[PDB]
UniProtKB/Swiss-Prot annotation:
This is Myoglobin. Its EC number is 1.7.-.-, 1.11.1.-. The modification Phosphoserine is found at S4. Monomeric. One of its GO terms (biological process) is removal of superoxide radicals. Belongs to the globin family. It comes from Physeter macrocephalus. Keywords: Cytoplasm, Heme, Iron, Metal-binding, Muscle protein, Oxidoreductase, Oxygen transport, Phosphoprotein, Transport. InterPro entries: Globin, Globin-like_sf, Myoglobin.
Amino acid sequence: MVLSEGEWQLVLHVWAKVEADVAGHGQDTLIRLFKSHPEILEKFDGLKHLKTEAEMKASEDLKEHGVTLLTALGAILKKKGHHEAELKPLAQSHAAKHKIPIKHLEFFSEAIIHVLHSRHPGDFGADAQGAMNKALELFRTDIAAKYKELGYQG
Ligand code: HEM
Protein backbone atom coordinates (compact mmCIF):
# COMPACT_ATOMS: atom_id res chain seq x y z
CA MET A 1 0.00 0.00 0.00
CA VAL A 2 1.09 3.57 -0.74
CA LEU A 3 -0.39 6.98 -0.15
CA SER A 4 -0.58 9.45 -2.99
CA GLU A 5 0.91 12.92 -2.75
CA GLY A 6 -2.63 14.21 -2.23
CA GLU A 7 -3.26 11.83 0.66
CA TRP A 8 0.03 12.81 2.29
CA GLN A 9 -0.88 16.47 1.94
CA LEU A 10 -4.18 15.88 3.73
CA VAL A 11 -2.35 14.01 6.50
CA LEU A 12 0.27 16.70 6.99
CA HIS A 13 -2.25 19.54 6.83
CA VAL A 14 -4.17 18.14 9.79
CA TRP A 15 -0.90 17.19 11.49
CA ALA A 16 0.12 20.85 11.39
CA LYS A 17 -2.82 21.50 13.73
CA VAL A 18 -1.40 18.92 16.16
CA GLU A 19 1.98 20.66 16.04
CA ALA A 20 0.43 23.93 17.24
CA ASP A 21 0.12 22.27 20.66
CA VAL A 22 1.98 18.99 20.80
CA ALA A 23 1.81 18.65 24.58
CA GLY A 24 -1.94 19.22 24.78
CA HIS A 25 -2.65 16.82 21.93
CA GLY A 26 -0.38 14.25 23.56
CA GLN A 27 -2.22 14.52 26.87
CA ASP A 28 -5.61 14.14 25.19
CA THR A 29 -4.44 11.17 23.12
CA LEU A 30 -2.82 9.27 26.00
CA ILE A 31 -5.67 9.94 28.44
CA ARG A 32 -8.17 8.67 25.85
CA LEU A 33 -5.99 5.63 25.16
CA PHE A 34 -5.53 4.76 28.83
CA LYS A 35 -9.23 5.10 29.63
CA SER A 36 -10.21 2.98 26.62
CA HIS A 37 -7.44 0.41 27.19
CA PRO A 38 -6.18 0.20 30.79
CA GLU A 39 -3.91 -2.67 29.78
CA ILE A 40 -1.84 -0.16 27.78
CA LEU A 41 -1.13 1.99 30.83
CA GLU A 42 0.58 -1.10 32.33
CA LYS A 43 3.22 -0.88 29.58
CA PHE A 44 4.45 2.50 30.93
CA ASP A 45 6.33 1.72 34.15
CA GLY A 46 6.31 5.35 35.29
CA LEU A 47 2.67 6.17 34.49
CA LYS A 48 0.76 3.05 35.55
CA HIS A 49 -0.30 4.39 38.99
CA LEU A 50 -2.32 7.27 37.49
CA LYS A 51 -6.10 6.96 37.76
CA THR A 52 -8.02 10.25 37.54
CA GLU A 53 -8.09 12.63 34.59
CA ALA A 54 -6.93 15.47 36.86
CA GLU A 55 -3.99 13.38 38.07
CA MET A 56 -3.09 12.41 34.50
CA LYS A 57 -3.31 16.05 33.44
CA ALA A 58 -1.03 17.08 36.32
CA SER A 59 1.65 14.51 35.45
CA GLU A 60 4.74 16.04 33.86
CA ASP A 61 5.84 12.49 32.98
CA LEU A 62 2.64 11.78 31.03
CA LYS A 63 2.96 15.10 29.21
CA GLU A 64 6.57 14.30 28.28
CA HIS A 65 5.52 10.85 27.03
CA GLY A 66 2.85 12.44 24.85
CA VAL A 67 5.38 14.88 23.39
CA THR A 68 7.88 12.08 22.73
CA LEU A 69 5.24 9.97 21.00
CA LEU A 70 3.68 12.68 18.85
CA THR A 71 7.01 14.28 17.89
CA ALA A 72 8.35 10.94 16.68
CA LEU A 73 5.10 10.20 14.84
CA GLY A 74 5.17 13.61 13.15
CA ALA A 75 8.72 12.98 11.92
CA ILE A 76 7.59 9.63 10.51
CA LEU A 77 4.54 11.15 8.79
CA LYS A 78 6.70 13.85 7.19
CA LYS A 79 8.79 11.06 5.61
CA LYS A 80 5.64 10.15 3.63
CA GLY A 81 6.30 6.42 3.77
CA HIS A 82 10.10 6.65 3.34
CA HIS A 83 10.54 5.94 7.02
CA GLU A 84 12.72 2.82 7.26
CA ALA A 85 15.41 4.74 9.14
CA GLU A 86 12.88 5.99 11.70
CA LEU A 87 11.00 2.72 12.10
CA LYS A 88 14.02 0.51 12.78
CA PRO A 89 15.00 2.00 16.19
CA LEU A 90 11.33 2.45 17.03
CA ALA A 91 10.70 -1.26 16.47
CA GLN A 92 13.66 -2.12 18.72
CA SER A 93 12.45 0.16 21.54
CA HIS A 94 9.03 -1.41 21.36
CA ALA A 95 10.45 -4.91 21.42
CA ALA A 96 12.58 -4.64 24.56
CA LYS A 97 11.24 -5.68 27.97
CA HIS A 98 7.73 -4.33 27.35
CA LYS A 99 6.83 -5.68 23.93
CA ILE A 100 4.24 -3.44 22.30
CA PRO A 101 1.78 -5.58 20.31
CA ILE A 102 0.67 -4.27 16.93
CA LYS A 103 -2.84 -4.23 18.39
CA HIS A 104 -1.75 -1.63 20.97
CA LEU A 105 -0.49 0.52 18.11
CA GLU A 106 -3.91 0.09 16.52
CA PHE A 107 -5.59 1.24 19.72
CA PHE A 108 -3.23 4.21 19.77
CA SER A 109 -4.22 4.96 16.17
CA GLU A 110 -7.90 4.95 17.17
CA ALA A 111 -7.15 7.37 20.00
CA ILE A 112 -5.33 9.92 17.84
CA ILE A 113 -8.07 9.66 15.21
CA HIS A 114 -10.66 10.39 17.88
CA VAL A 115 -8.63 13.43 18.99
CA LEU A 116 -8.51 14.71 15.41
CA HIS A 117 -12.28 14.33 14.96
CA SER A 118 -12.85 16.05 18.31
CA ARG A 119 -10.43 18.96 17.94
CA HIS A 120 -10.07 19.69 14.20
CA PRO A 121 -13.21 18.65 12.29
CA GLY A 122 -12.80 21.53 9.82
CA ASP A 123 -9.41 20.12 8.78
CA PHE A 124 -10.45 16.49 9.16
CA GLY A 125 -13.13 15.93 6.54
CA ALA A 126 -13.87 12.72 4.67
CA ASP A 127 -10.78 12.72 2.46
CA ALA A 128 -8.43 13.54 5.35
CA GLN A 129 -10.05 10.81 7.49
CA GLY A 130 -9.37 8.23 4.79
CA ALA A 131 -5.81 9.43 4.30
CA MET A 132 -5.00 9.38 8.03
CA ASN A 133 -6.48 5.86 8.33
CA LYS A 134 -4.10 4.77 5.59
CA ALA A 135 -1.05 6.60 6.95
CA LEU A 136 -1.41 4.96 10.35
CA GLU A 137 -2.15 1.58 8.78
CA LEU A 138 1.05 1.89 6.71
CA PHE A 139 3.01 2.75 9.87
CA ARG A 140 1.62 -0.33 11.63
CA THR A 141 2.24 -2.61 8.62
CA ASP A 142 5.85 -1.48 8.30
CA ILE A 143 6.48 -1.67 12.08
CA ALA A 144 5.13 -5.22 12.03
CA ALA A 145 7.74 -6.15 9.39
CA LYS A 146 10.51 -4.55 11.45
CA TYR A 147 9.32 -6.40 14.57
CA LYS A 148 9.63 -9.67 12.66
CA GLU A 149 13.16 -8.84 11.50
CA LEU A 150 14.14 -8.61 15.18
CA GLY A 151 12.42 -11.86 16.17
CA TYR A 152 9.19 -10.37 17.56
CA GLN A 153 5.91 -11.42 15.94
CA GLY A 154 3.99 -8.40 17.30
C1 HEM B 1 0.16 1.79 22.63
C2 HEM B 1 1.18 2.49 22.14
C3 HEM B 1 2.62 2.54 22.72
C4 HEM B 1 3.16 2.00 23.82
C5 HEM B 1 2.49 1.13 24.91
C6 HEM B 1 4.57 2.38 23.85
C7 HEM B 1 5.49 2.01 24.81
C8 HEM B 1 6.84 2.31 24.81
C9 HEM B 1 7.80 1.85 25.78
C10 HEM B 1 7.50 0.93 26.99
C11 HEM B 1 9.00 2.34 25.46
C12 HEM B 1 10.27 2.12 26.31
C13 HEM B 1 11.39 1.24 25.82
C14 HEM B 1 12.44 1.42 26.89
O1 HEM B 1 12.06 1.52 28.09
O2 HEM B 1 13.64 1.51 26.56
C15 HEM B 1 8.84 3.17 24.27
C16 HEM B 1 9.80 3.89 23.62
C17 HEM B 1 9.56 4.80 22.61
N1 HEM B 1 8.37 4.95 21.91
FE1 HEM B 1 6.62 4.05 22.36
N2 HEM B 1 4.83 3.16 22.75
C18 HEM B 1 3.67 3.26 22.04
C19 HEM B 1 3.52 3.94 20.86
C20 HEM B 1 4.46 4.75 20.28
C21 HEM B 1 4.33 5.42 19.02
C22 HEM B 1 3.06 5.34 18.15
C23 HEM B 1 5.45 6.13 18.82
C24 HEM B 1 5.85 7.04 17.63
C25 HEM B 1 5.37 6.92 16.39
C26 HEM B 1 6.34 5.88 19.93
C27 HEM B 1 7.60 6.42 20.09
C28 HEM B 1 8.53 5.97 21.00
C29 HEM B 1 9.88 6.49 21.15
C30 HEM B 1 10.48 7.65 20.33
C31 HEM B 1 10.48 5.80 22.12
C32 HEM B 1 11.93 5.98 22.63
C33 HEM B 1 12.08 7.22 23.50
C34 HEM B 1 11.72 6.90 24.92
O3 HEM B 1 12.20 5.86 25.45
O4 HEM B 1 10.95 7.67 25.53
N3 HEM B 1 5.71 5.03 20.80
N4 HEM B 1 7.50 3.12 23.92
